[PDB]
Design a protein around this ligand. Structure first.
Ligand SMILES: [Mg+2]
Lengths: 51, 101, 95, 199, 55, 492
DNA sequence: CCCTGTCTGGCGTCCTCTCACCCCATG
DNA sequence: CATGGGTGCGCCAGACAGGG
C-alpha cells in the first residue's frame, strides 16, 4: 500500500551548452505537478549563490 | 479477448498512419482533414482546438467520423495533401483558417 | 533535491480443540447425524476412533452416508480409526 | 466423414454433417440480469424453469391476495373494536373467545348490531370473493397466451446496466449552456478557496 | 464468483479537506520566518501526525 | 442404429486386423472421459457397450478401495458390499446415469481413441511383423528437415527421425527425397517419432553389404568387424568357412561393382575390405592395408601393438589425419602405434637400457647379468618377482639359489618402491601413520608428507608455526591435530 | 402568325440515433 | 387459401392552346 512507481531520469538531453532538458518517468497520476512545482519553487529562490 | 500483447501491436500500426477526420455536414474541403492518432483512454475523439474553426465544430454534442486510408498511396495522400498542417489557409481567399478562436 | 530532502528529515493425547466439538458441527446430512446419535457418538473424538467396518454395522447407515462422513472428516484433516490415548478427557465425563 | 455418419452406431439420430451450433449473443454492454419472463403458446410442453416461474407467480399472487384478505380483515376487526368501545362494552370478555365471532355479544337492536351485520356481509363477501378471485388468478397464471404465427415460447431477459460518467457524456444546465465533459480531473488539481473546499 | 456477492465501489480515502494557511512567525526573535498551519479533515480512520508522517 | 454398431466393429476389425474387444474397451474409456467433461465436479465414470446391439449404459463408477482418498470417485469395500456382497477391492460400483448423448463431440473423441488404439494395435503389429526392417535398411520419404534432425515418413502413420549425428557430413536432404537408413533403436514416442534411423553408424555399412552381397545374406560370408569414419572411409573384416569362396573377392564383386554400389549410397565413402584372421598380428597386417607392414611387436599386457613400416610407407600407414591407423585400431580393438623400422629399434634399445638400469639399480646385479635378463625377455621387476621358477631356471647360468635370491630382491625392491611413494605422498604409509590424528583427510596427509611429516610421531614433534603455510589448515586445526598426535604417541 | 394565358412538370442540405409496423378475406 | 383491386407550397419554365 506504500509501494508507488519509483521514477528515474531516463535521459538528460542537454541541448547545446548552459542548457539541459531532464525528463523523469514514471510518476503517479498527479506527482509530476508536485515535483515540478517543488523543484521549480526551490531552484527559483532557495538555491543560494553570489552576484 | 484483448490480451496484454495486442496494445503494443496497436501502438506499432497507429504510428505514422494518418486518419481522415470528417465533420458530418462537410461544406468545403477543410471539413476532411488527416491527423495522426494518439491513443485515448476514453470513448471520445480528442480534436485539436484551432482545427475546430475549420470544421465549424463546437463541442456541444458534435460527432465526427474517422476513415482509414488503407493503401499506401492513400496514406501518402493523407500526409502530403490532406494533413492538418497543410491546411492553414482557407482556399476561398488568403485568410488563415488556423486562427486562434 | 538535497535542500528539499534536508527539509524533511525531522518527519520521516486426544487430538486438539477440534476433537471436543459435537458431531452436529460437521454439517452432516440429517440421516448421518441421527444414525451417529443412535450409537451414542456425540463428539468428533468418538467418531474418529470408530473404524469404517464398525460404522457400517450401525442400523440405517448406508454406503452413501459413510462416504459423506469420510469426505467431511477429510476436509478437516481427520481420518476414521485414529487411536486417541486418554479419550474422553475428565472434563467431558460429567455431562 | 465415416465417424460423422457413425453418430447412428453408438446412439442414433442420423448424420453429423448438420452444423451443430448454439445461438450465442454479441458484446458492447455489461449488466446484471434482474428479471426473466417466459411466455408459452398453449399446447407446448412447459420446461422445468417455466414451471418454476409458474410456481413462483402462483406463490406471489397467493401470498398477495391472502395478505389483502388478512390486512382488510385486520381493518375490519379494528372497526369492530372501535364500535364496541361503547354500548355493552366487554373489557375482559372481548379477547377470551376467537376473533371471528365478535357479533353475538350482548348488544340490542341498535345502529351497532346493524353495523356488525353490515360488516358480516362485507366479511362473507370477502370470503367468497377471495375464493373466486384466487381461482381466476390461478387460471390467468396457468393458461397460455396467444402469440405470433408459429412461435413456441418467448424468453425476455432484462439486463440492468449502471452507466456512471466519463469524458464524452453531455451535461447541461437549465439555460442552454451545453457541453461535452472533457476531462475528469483528480481532486487535488481543482481550484480551492481560502477555506479548503475544492470546486 | 457466486451470484450472491455484491460489489460496491471502494473509496479508500480517509481525508476530505486539507487546508494550509501560512502566517508570520514571532516565537523566534529572528524575523522573516513562517509558520505552516495545516487543518486537515479526517473521517476518524487516520491519526493526523501519522498522516503528515506518511505524506 | 443397432446393426450399424456391428457393421462398424466388423469393418474396423477386418481393415485393421484388430480384436473387436480392444476397440470396445477403448470406446468405453472414450465415452467415460467425454461424460466426465460434462459434469462440473470430478466424477468417476464407467461406460459399458453391449456387443450385440451397440447400446451403451453409463455409470457413476466408484472404485472399490480399502482407504478412500477421493470420496467423489472411491468407495470403501464395506460400503460397496452393502449394495452388492459380490464386490471386491478394484471393482466398480455403478449409479444409474444419463448415457452420454452421442453427437459430434463424443463422435470426435471416439474417432481419436480408435485412431490411438490402432496406433497401439494395427501399427504395433505392423512393426512386429517388420522385425527385419527394425534393424535392416528401412526406406522413408523426407517429410521435414530441421537444424538438428530429419523427420522421415515410412507410410501407415509411422514417423522416423534421423538425428544430426546419425547423418553423413555432406548429405543435403529436401522434403520429398527418398532416404535409406538402418532402424537402430525403437523407443516409446508413439506420438511423434519413436523410430531412430542412422546413416552414420557401422550397422548401415553391414546391412548395405548384406543386401549387395548375396553370400553375406546366405551366411556363407560373415562380417566380423566394421570400423567407420562416416562419409570419408570405412574398413570391414570378412571371414568365410567355405575354402572355395574368396570373401574379399565376393564383397568387391566383378570390377568392384558391389563395393562401388555401397560407396555410392554412402556419398562416395571409401571402403576397404580386409580378410579376418584369428591371429591378431596377421589381422592387424590385413587391417593396415594398403600400407605394407615390415614388423609387429605385440604388448599383450597393455593391449597395444607397435607397427614398423618402411619410411616411404609411414605416411600411408598413418593416413590423412591418422584415419588409417584409427580405423585399423577400431577394427582390431588394439591400440596401434605406427613408427619406422629405425624408430622401433631405437624404442626397443631405449626400453632395454631402461630395464637394465632398473635391474642394476634395484636387484644389485651387474650390467652383464641385467642384459641377459632383458635378452631372455624380462622387462619389469614384477615379471622377475612373480614368473614361474621354471622359466627363470631355463636361463643359462641361473641356479635355484640365485633365482630365489633374485626373486627375493625383486619383491623387496617392489615393496621398497611402494613404501617410498606411499610415504612421499599420502597413498598408504602417510595415509595411516600421519592420518592417525583424528581429522586428517587423505589430502592433508599428503600435504603434511610433502613437508616431510610422514608419521604420527613427525606430526607430534611439529609446532603450529611449522604447519601454518598448509592450505586448508587453520592454527586451531593444526593445534588440535598436533595435540591429538601427542596424545597417541606420548600418552597412549 | 404574334403575343397572352393556362396546364403540367421538376425541384427543393448532410451525417446519425432510436421507435412502430408492414393486404383483407373468405366461400 | 390465394388473389385482386384530399381539399394549407411556391417559383421557373417551356409546351400547349387561345385569342388578338
Ligand atoms: Mg456543433
Amino acid at each position: 500500500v506504500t509501494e508507488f512507481l519509483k521514477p528515474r531520469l531516463v535521459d538528460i538531453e542537454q541541448v547545446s551548452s548552459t542548457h539541459a532538458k531532464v525528463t523523469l518517468e514514471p510518476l503517479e497520476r498527479g506527482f509530476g505537478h508536485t515535483l515540478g512545482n517543488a523543484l521549480r519553487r526551490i531552484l527559483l529562490s532557495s538555491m543560494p549563490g553570489c552576484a | 479477448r484483448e490480451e496484454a500483447v495486442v496494445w503494443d501491436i496497436l501502438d506499432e500500426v497507429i504510428r505514422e498512419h494518418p486518419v481522415l477526420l470528417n465533420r458530418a455536414p462537410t461544406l468545403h474541403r477543410l471539413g476532411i482533414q488527416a491527423f495522426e492518432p494518439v491513443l485515448i483512454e476514453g470513448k471520445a475523439i480528442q480534436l485539436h482546438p484551432l482545427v475546430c474553426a475549420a470544421y465549424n465544430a463546437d463541442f456541444d454534442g458534435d460527432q465526427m467520423a474517422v476513415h482509414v486510408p488503407l493503401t499506401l498511396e492513400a496514406q501518402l495522400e493523407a500526409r502530403a495533401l490532406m494533413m492538418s498542417t497543410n491546411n492553414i489557409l482557407s482556399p476561398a481567399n488568403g485568410e488563415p483558417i488556423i486562427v486562434p478562436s | 533535491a538535497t535542500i528539499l530532502a534536508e527539509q524533511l528529515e525531522a518527519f520521516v493425547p486426544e487430538f486438539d480443540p477440534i476433537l471436543l466439538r459435537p458431531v452436529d458441527d460437521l454439517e452432516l446430512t440429517v440421516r448421518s447425524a441421527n444414525c451417529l446419535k443412535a450409537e451414542a457418538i456425540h463428539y468428533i473424538g468418538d467418531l474418529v476412533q470408530r473404524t469404517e467396518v464398525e460404522l457400517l454395522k450401525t442400523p440405517n447407515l448406508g454406503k452413501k452416508s459413510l462416504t459423506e462422513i469420510k469426505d467431511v472428516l477429510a476436509s478437516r484433516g481427520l481420518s476414521l480409526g485414529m487411536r486417541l490415548e486418554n479419550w474422553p478427557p475428565a472434563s467431558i465425563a460429567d455431562e | 466423414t465415416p465417424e460423422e455418419k457413425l453418430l447412428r452406431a453408438i446412439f442414433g439420430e442420423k448424420a453429423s454433417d448438420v452444423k451443430d451450433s448454439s445461438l450465442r449473443v454479441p458484446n458492447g454492454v455489461s449488466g446484471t440480469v434482474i428479471d426473466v419472463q417466459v411466455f408459452t403458446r398453449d399446447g407446448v410442453e412447459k420446461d422445468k424453469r417455466a414451471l418454476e416461474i409458474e410456481e413462483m407467480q402462483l406463490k406471489q399472487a397467493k401470498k398477495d391476495l391472502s395478505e389483502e384478505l388478512q390486512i382488510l380483515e385486520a381493518g375490519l376487526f379494528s372497526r369492530i373494536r372501535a364500535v364496541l368501545v361503547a354500548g355493552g362494552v366487554e373489557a375482559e370478555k372481548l379477547d377470551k373467545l376467537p376473533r371471528d365471532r365478535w357479533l353475538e355479544l350482548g348488544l340490542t337492536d341498535e345502529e351497532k348490531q346493524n353495523q356488525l351485520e353490515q360488516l358480516a356481509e362485507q366479511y362473507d363477501e370477502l370470503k367468497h370473493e377471495f375464493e373466486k378471485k384466487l381461482e381466476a388468478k390461478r387460471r390467468k397464471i396457468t393458461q397460455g397466451d396467444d402469440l405470433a404465427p408459429g412461435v413456441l415460447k418467448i424468453v425476455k431477459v432484462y439486463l440492468a446496466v449502471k452507466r456512471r460518467i466519463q469524458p464524452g457524456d453531455k451535461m447541461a444546465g437549465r439555460h442552454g449552456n451545453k457541453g461535452v465533459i472533457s476531462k475528469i480531473n483528480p481532486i487535488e488539481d481543482m481550484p480551492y478557496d481560502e477555506n479548503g473546499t475544492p470546486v | 464468483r457466486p451470484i450472491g456477492r455484491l460489489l460496491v465501489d471502494a473509496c479508500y480515502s480517509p481525508v476530505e479537506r486539507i487546508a494550509y494557511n501560512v502566517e508570520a512567525a514571532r516565537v523566534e526573535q529572528r524575523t522573516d520566518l513562517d509558520k505552516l498551519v495545516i487543518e486537515m479533515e479526517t473521517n476518524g480512520t487516520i491519526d493526523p501526525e501519522e498522516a503528515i508522517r506518511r505524506a | 442404429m443397432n446393426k450399424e454398431i456391428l457393421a462398424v466393429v466388423e469393418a474396423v476389425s477386418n481393415e485393421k486386423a484388430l480384436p473387436r474387444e480392444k476397440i470396445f474397451e477403448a470406446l468405453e474409456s472414450a465415452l467415460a472421459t467425454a461424460t466426465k467433461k460434462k459434469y462440473e465436479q470430478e466424477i468417476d465414470v464407467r461406460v459399458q457397450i453391449d456387443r450385440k446391439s451397440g447400446d451403451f449404459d453409463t455409470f457413476r463408477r466408484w472404485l472399490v478401495v480399502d482407504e478412500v482418498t477421493q470420496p467423489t470417485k472411491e468407495i470403501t469395500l464395506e460400503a460397496a458390499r452393502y449394495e452388492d456382497e459380490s464386490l471386491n477391492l478394484g471393482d466398480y460400483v455403478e449409479d444409474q446415469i444419463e448415457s452420454v448423448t452421442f453427437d459430434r463431440i463424443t463422435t470426435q473423441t471416439a474417432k481419436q481413441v480408435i485412431v490411438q488404439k490402432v496406433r497401439e494395435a494395427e501399427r504395433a503389429m505392423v512393426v512386429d511383423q517388420f522385425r527385419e526392417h527394425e534393424g535392416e535398411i528401412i526406406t522413408g520419404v523426407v517429410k521435414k528437415v530441421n537444424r538438428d534432425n530429419i523427420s522421415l515418413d515410412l507410410g501407415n502413420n509411422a514417423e522416423a527421425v534421423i538425428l544430426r549425428e546419425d547423418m553423413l557430413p555432406r548429405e543435403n536432404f529436401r522434403p520429398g527425397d527418398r532416404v535409406r537408413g538402418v532402424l537402430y533403436s525403437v523407443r516409446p514416442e508413439a506420438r511423434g517419432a519413436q523410430l531412430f534411423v542412422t546413416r552414420s553408424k557401422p550397422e548401415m555399412l553391414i546391412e548395405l553389404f548384406r543386401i549387395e552381397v548375396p553370400e553375406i545374406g546366405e551366411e556363407v560370408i560373415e562380417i566380423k568387424a566394421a570400423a567407420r569414419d562416416p562419409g570419408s572411409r570405412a574398413k570391414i573384416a570378412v571371414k568365410t568357412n567355405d575354402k572355395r569362396i574368396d570373401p574379399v573377392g565376393a564383397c568387391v564383386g566383378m570390377r568392384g561393382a558391389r563395393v562401388q554400389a555401397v560407396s555410392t549410397e554412402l556419398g562416395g565413402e571409401r571402403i576397404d575390405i580386409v580378410l579376418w584372421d584369428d591371429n591378431p598380428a596377421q589381422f592387424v597386417i590385413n587391417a593396415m592395408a594398403p600400407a605394407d607392414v615390415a614388423s609387429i611387436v605385440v604388448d599383450e599386457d597393455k593391449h597395444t601393438m607397435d607397427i614398423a613400416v618402411e619410411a616411404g610407407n609411414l605416411a600411408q600407414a598413418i593416413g590423412r589425419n591418422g584415419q588409417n591407423v584409427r580405423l585399423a585400431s577400431q577394427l582390431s580393438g588394439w591400440e596401434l602405434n605406427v613408427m619406422t623400422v629405425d624408430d622401433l629399434q631405437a624404442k626397443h634399445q631405449a626400453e632395454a637400457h631402461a630395464a637394465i638400469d632398473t635391474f642394476t639399480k634395484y636387484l644389485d646385479i651387474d650390467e652383464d647379468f641385467a642384459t641377459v635378463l632383458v635378452e631372455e625377455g624380462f622387462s619389469t621387476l614384477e615379471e622377475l618377482a612373480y614368473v614361474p621358477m621354471k622359466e627363470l631356471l631355463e636361463i643359462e647360468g641361473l641356479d635355484e639359489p640365485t633365482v630365489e635370491a633374485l626373486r627375493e630382491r625383486a619383491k623387496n625392491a617392489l615393496a621398497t618402491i611402494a613404501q617410498a611413494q606411499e610415504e612421499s605422498l599420502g597413498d598408504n604409509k602417510p595415509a595411516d601413520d600421519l592420518l592417525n590424528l583424528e581429522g586428517v583427510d587423505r589430502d592433508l596427509a599428503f600435504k603434511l608428507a610433502a613437508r616431510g611429516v610422514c608419521t604420527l610421531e613427525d606430526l607430534a614433534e611439529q609446532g603450529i608455526d611449522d604447519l601454518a603455510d598448509i592450505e586448508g589448515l587453520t592454527d586451531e586445526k593444526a593445534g588440535a591435530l598436533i595435540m591429538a598426535a601427542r596424545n597417541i604417541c606420548w600418552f597412549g
